[PDB]
Amino acid sequence: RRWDDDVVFKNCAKGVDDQKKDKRFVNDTLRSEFHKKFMEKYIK
Amino acid sequence: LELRAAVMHDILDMMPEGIKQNKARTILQHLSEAWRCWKANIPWKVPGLPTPIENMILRYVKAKADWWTNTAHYNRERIRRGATVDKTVCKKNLGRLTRLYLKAEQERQHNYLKDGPYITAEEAVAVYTTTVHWLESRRFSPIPFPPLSYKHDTKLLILALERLKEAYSVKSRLNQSQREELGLIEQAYDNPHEALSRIKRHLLTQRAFKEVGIEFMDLYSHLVPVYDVEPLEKITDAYLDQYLWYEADKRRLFPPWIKPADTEPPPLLVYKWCQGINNLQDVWETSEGECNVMLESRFEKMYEKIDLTLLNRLLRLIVDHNIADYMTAKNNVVINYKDMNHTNSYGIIRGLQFASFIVQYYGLVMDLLVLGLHRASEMAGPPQMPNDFLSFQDIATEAAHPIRLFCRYIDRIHIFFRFTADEARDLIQRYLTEHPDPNNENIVGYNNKKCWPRDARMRLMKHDVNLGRAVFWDIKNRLPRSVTTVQWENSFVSVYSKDNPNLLFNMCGFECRILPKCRTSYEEFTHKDGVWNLQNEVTKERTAQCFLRVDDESMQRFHNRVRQILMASGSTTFTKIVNKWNTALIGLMTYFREAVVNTQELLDLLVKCENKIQTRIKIGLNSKMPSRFPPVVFYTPKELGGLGMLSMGHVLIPQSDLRWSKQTDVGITHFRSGMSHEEDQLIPNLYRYIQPWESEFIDSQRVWAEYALKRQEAIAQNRRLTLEDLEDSWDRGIPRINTLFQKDRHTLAYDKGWRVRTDFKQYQVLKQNPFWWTHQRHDGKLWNLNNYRTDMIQALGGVEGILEHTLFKGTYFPTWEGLFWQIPNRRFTLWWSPTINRANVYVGFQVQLDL
Amino acid sequence: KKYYPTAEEVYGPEVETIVQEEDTQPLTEPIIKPVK
Amino acid sequence: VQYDQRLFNQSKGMDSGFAGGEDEIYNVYDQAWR
Amino acid sequence: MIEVVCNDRLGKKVRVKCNTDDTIGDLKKLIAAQTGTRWNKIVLKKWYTIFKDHVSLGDYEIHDGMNLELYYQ
Amino acid sequence: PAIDSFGFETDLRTHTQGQAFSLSVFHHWQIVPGDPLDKSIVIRPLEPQPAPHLAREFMIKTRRRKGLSEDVSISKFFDDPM
Amino acid sequence: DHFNKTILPKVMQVKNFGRSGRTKYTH
Amino acid sequence: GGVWRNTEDEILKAAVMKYGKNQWSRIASLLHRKSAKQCKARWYEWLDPSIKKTEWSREEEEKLLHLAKLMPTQWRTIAPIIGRTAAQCLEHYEFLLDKAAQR
Amino acid sequence: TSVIKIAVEPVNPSELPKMLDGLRKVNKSYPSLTTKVEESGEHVILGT
Amino acid sequence: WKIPPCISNWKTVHINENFAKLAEALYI
RNA sequence: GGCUAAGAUC
């Protein structure tokens, strides 16, 4: 109580805004979960 | 070859419409030009063709793209360590991932224009109002327009041109782009008013920029891009970054909440943060139900999800309208690859020279959203009396504060959130109601350090693990997902309670372990004299102890850096391989002075790598796998004709390598050095001849206090401070005192932000420069290893003992004095010819050359 | 975020298209005979 | 203050010292042996 | 005490520890104790330099690990 | 005592060169020394003593469940003076 | 064997890239 | 340097016809007056045959005025948005429209 | 009387009803095995 | 079944109303 | 005549 007063953004409550994760495979190898993680972890 | 032969087998079978002048190698050339067009991520297809022939060509191209992407991810997963061997696969894996990084940025920038992944325009008006309210509360004056007759523009132009010349042109550099770069620097140095008039017309009129080249660095752990810019626009951008940092030092527009600045970038990020955590109002005491939570996390999204509209509106609030349009247009010019040509205006280019002012713009913007407008006003204080990096206005300010400290890195962020008894129970109740976990799934995934995780890691209790989720959830929900998110995979929130006496935090260089003696701490091993005795500012006693172990990411980066020097053998000289490791070791041992002595895994990497390089350099001489190579052929300095390897490990010289012999008139006086009591080590480790940071910061406080007392005595008695008065006050202290007494002392003081600009300098240069610690201009030379070469020659057996193993007796020189000068490999192998060719160094051999 | 067409309308609502990734019987159930 | 002129301007500067990632300059041992 | 490794051809390679002032006649008795031949029928050689039968090991400066090419007479 | 009889059958066969064999049957209870309400007994976290402060260590070890948690001197909340 | 082999950091049996046997002879 | 003159445009049009459009080194081996980066800029801005180098009508002026408020910087991003794709005349048309509306 | 008491918890916390169903089936086999769920959530098992 | 050669290498609206809505809100 | 990092290339 009264610990977050000047907080502009109150609560997002949405990580991916459609589901908890992807949970859907696609034949496009570039637009998939494998190339999305390999371009985010190994690359910077 | 199998995909090419099956394509010809399919094209000759899948409907050629009989013998009707069928296809040839031009149809395979059409498939070859289609793959080369897709390889640069270009939208150029192969138009003007039959539909089944195009469908058969696109089917084999989509199958070849599945093979090439799977071969790229397989080599990248084995790129961290993988095999510790790479001859030509390193250039191919970097070139394949450069195509994937350019294609993913091209699809994301095309999605930003076509679709609308904006910056949440309803909340974006609040972020522009938050910066307008925070600047009005601090009453900071905006950055003025660049004057046409500025007296300070002469020193600002000389400081920026000196940084550009020392970075690019060092030694042995010649290129078609480096010729115009060094030519424009000399043309500006011979005419400062001509370059100042050109830089003024480039900012106030030219609201565009030329193309820039993106190239990824050769980092095996995580690739970092390097944005090569136009040579004319680089000198114009350097004047904008120098003038913005010079104006920010006078107007104080950058608060000390985000401190990567050039005060003390290794110690004050660690030691002043540890002393600040210990000098708080009853921080180590938690018997009254209190709890502490240190949340260490990186944003990892304030480099590509930047909004150009919000960055342009914040630049108009911070600087003039002419400087704001030039700064925003430089980040939206072009992203030119080796073959591709991607668009822009989707994020911020951090490779440009003006990226330091843009990083501090988001640094004050994101910290104001994470902490608060009324929160930051109570943290930094009024502009009539600003606070320090870890100070406060009064004791009542830090008492009623839920966030006691907030240190912000360029990418990371640290917050030592203090909670009371009722505040912790209220926060966990809001976290459980919004995110329940009935099957104890809240303690399923939780990161922990490697600093002996048996009694010193985070104690996975019930209330402690619940407060670890709650402190992170309030910080994650405080920031929006479009501006800057905070993932859990990169975060580490170690809580402190009655159940967990040990506290852990990963600092900017390494991991630190705070454990007070009064709170029944951990096993307290203390493998060396590297345990910091953090004292309280009030009691001035042993408040808490601080352990400083090296980080795992820096140890993996050093293991990759030692692997690059080991893989470079054979294709270079033997002296170049030793000089590459000596610069890599001095950069690691000086920055980890107390950490390298108190880490058993770090010393095991040094003894394995130094034995590998002595194995690597011995193979280049001969390839018969020698039994006992002499250590005097490696540890001799370059003045006495040696490789000069810094021995950071116990490599003891044998007793059969310290005997001299000379026959002048009477007989062969066989001399021998007497040190056979216990052991005769060749050279001590570099940690013994380098001052630790705890002893350096303790001596620096006595250094400037004696300096301020002597300067006050010289000002009162009206006397000149001579060199004899500053003899014992010359050592080092906080910053090298000789840096204040330099010939360019008047010019170096007018260039603020030395540590911040050097951090992005490695992000913009092609080679991974190990200058992230400090620079010799502002900070000065600290690792003075002049007493190491005097001890290395005296332990090896003197100048006569080192020359006895050489071919000095055959050269016929009556006095050992200064006589120095495949070609350097030939002179080194012939100099140590009696040392590298004997019966003990090579056992089974009777080969005679000739008559 | 992302933007992609759903597979429910392409393959029809009748055919329950499943997409199994991993983590099912790591070389134990078809390897040896089951414990009867 | 007004210090003596022998102490000030004793050396040059305006350089970062460790110039780039060129690990072939032998930056250690700033003073010669003999 | 030097560990002279009498490493001949075709697998016959043994270690022979002898004193520094020990004669070469004592070395052939120790080399035959690990090889399995008569010590009178062993001729040590180092590029056509047949050693004597009366010169001590300290005169040849044979240090530790100085291997020898053994041959049979 | 069953609090320290764990592996007593395994220890009786090990030290007696394998020529012994013991079986544990249930027996009536007896009061352990010390008192759980007694204070000024700092129990060690590891390797405890055979000192008669075992009841304070047994009450703190019984605090893994709910009810009699740490700081077990709250019996005056149920036994307030008058 | 002239060294004491106790000041040395963890163990140095053979530094010639051939340590097949992994033993110290205490067990 | 490399202002894409009449002599440079004829050499760039010959290299785009004979050598190729995606060969900056081949165009650099036949001009010897500007860099390869300047030849790629001249082939896209000045010597581009598909570049609309005229017709700054009211439909293009209103599109440039609407894109000016929507994006004050990023003239390279606003050049195919207006359809002119000049990336240098867009700043010139914005300068002429501001000079006409200066009053 | 089953004086000995040993606690039992699964390694993966997602398999909580799988260990709860096994403790119910083990209580039916052995008569003296009285699986008493403690107040702290730790599934205890009384043994002889 | 014609086979034309292929030699080219060296050998919907592009706008959104959310971008104008974000700019007008920042202008207001 | 194919695949190799517009193959790097003034």
Coordinates of N, CA and C in Angstrom, one line a residue, chain C residues 5 8 17 20-21 28 33:
Chain C
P5 N -0.4 -16.7 -40.7 CA -1.7 -17.4 -40.8 C -1.8 -18.6 -39.9
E8 N -5.3 -23.8 -38.6 CA -6.6 -24.5 -38.3 C -7.5 -24.4 -39.6
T17 N -4.9 -31.5 -36.8 CA -3.5 -31.4 -37.1 C -2.7 -31.2 -35.9
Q20 N 3.8 -32.5 -32.9 CA 4.6 -33.0 -31.8 C 6.1 -32.7 -32.0
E21 N 6.7 -32.1 -31.0 CA 8.1 -31.7 -31.1 C 9.1 -32.7 -30.6
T28 N 13.6 -46.0 -25.0 CA 13.4 -47.1 -24.0 C 12.2 -48.0 -24.3
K33 N 11.7 -54.8 -24.9 CA 10.4 -55.2 -24.6 C 9.8 -54.6 -23.3

